Amino acid sequence: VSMTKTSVDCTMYICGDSTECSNLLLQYGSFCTQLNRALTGIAVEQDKN
């Protein structure tokens, strides 16, 4: 009927506590927001299910 909801912090995963890495990650635009939006979409659906 469900599976575990997961939220993955895309900045802490890619660039864990590095500011100079975070400034390079911003060059890739929206991809972390797309990943957060997709996983939030799955998470909201487990309650709907």
Partner 1 sequence: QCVNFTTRTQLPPAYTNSFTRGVYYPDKVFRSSVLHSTQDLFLPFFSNVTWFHAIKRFANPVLPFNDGVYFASTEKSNIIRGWIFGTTLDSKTQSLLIVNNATNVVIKVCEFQFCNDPFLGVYYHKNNKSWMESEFRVYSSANNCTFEYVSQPFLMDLEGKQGNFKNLREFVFKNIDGYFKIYSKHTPINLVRGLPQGFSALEPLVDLPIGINITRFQTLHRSYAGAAAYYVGYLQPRTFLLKYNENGTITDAVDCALDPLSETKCTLKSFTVEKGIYQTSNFRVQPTESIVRFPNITNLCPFGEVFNATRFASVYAWNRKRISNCVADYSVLYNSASFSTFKCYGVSPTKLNDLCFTNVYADSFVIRGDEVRQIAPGQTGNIADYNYKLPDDFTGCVIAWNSNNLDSKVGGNYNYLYRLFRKSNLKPFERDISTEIYQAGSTPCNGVKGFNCYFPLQSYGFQPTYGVGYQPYRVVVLSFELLHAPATVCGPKKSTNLVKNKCVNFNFNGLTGTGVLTESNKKFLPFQQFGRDIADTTDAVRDPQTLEILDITPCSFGGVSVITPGTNTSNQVAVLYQGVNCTEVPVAIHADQLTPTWRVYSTGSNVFQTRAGCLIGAEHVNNSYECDIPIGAGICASYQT
Partner 2 sequence: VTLADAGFIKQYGDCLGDIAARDLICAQKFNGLTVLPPLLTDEMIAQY
Partner 3 sequence: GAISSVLNDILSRLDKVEAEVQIDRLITGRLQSLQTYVTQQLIRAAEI
Task: Tell me which residues touch partner 3 (CB under 8 A).
Answer: 1-3, 6, 8, 10, 13-16, 18, 20-21, 24-25, 28, 31, 35, 38-39, 42, 45-46, 49
22 closest CA partner among 14, 34, 8, 30: 14
Quote the CA–CA distance of 9 and 15 in Å, as a whole number.
10
Among 2, 6, 17, 27, binds partner 1 (CB under 8 A): 17
What is the contact surface with partner 1 in residues (CB under 8 A)?
Answer: 7, 9, 11-12, 16-17, 36, 40, 47
